[PDB]
């Protein structure tokens, strides 16, 4: 019964109770918010190619 003197909690249970959640990358914030502020740029810049100022306040010619 030498196995009952060993710690009963496995190494697998340590690795799954210690590294439980996949950690959040530091670049995820930059990638996601830059992909969304690209749409903020494209809609609302006055120098963006597909700007939404002429669809919203149309013109007066």
């Amino acid at each position: 019964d030498r196995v009952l003197s060993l710690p009963a909690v496995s190494k697998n249970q340590v690795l799954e109770n210690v590294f439980h959640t996949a950690p959040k990358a530091p670049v995820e914030h930059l990638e996601k918010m830059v992909s969304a502020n690209s749409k903020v740029y494209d809609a609302l810049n006055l120098q963006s190619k597909r700007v939404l100022i002429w669809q919203v306040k149309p013109a007066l010619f």
Binding site: H20, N37, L52
Partner: protein, 95 residues
Amino acid sequence: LSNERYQLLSQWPDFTTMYGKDFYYRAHPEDLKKFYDAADEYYKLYETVTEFDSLSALASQVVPNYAARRRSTVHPAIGSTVADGAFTNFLLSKQ
């Protein structure tokens, strides 16, 4: 209106200042899972409030019912107050 929703996605607290591993291991596991789900939820809300190329096809859903209300058989500008006032004139005249 999307500006009004964007302005309250602008006052959201920075969860990225709590991603470090000194905040990982001090926290209860289910609370950290809830925190990472809350960060993913904010990225969902911010990715959809800045889809401004959807507002045109949203405005095209308000146009047909309104434009069918203005194809009235009486008048384009008729409403309930003028029609009730004209029923007041019509009914209180000599038949």
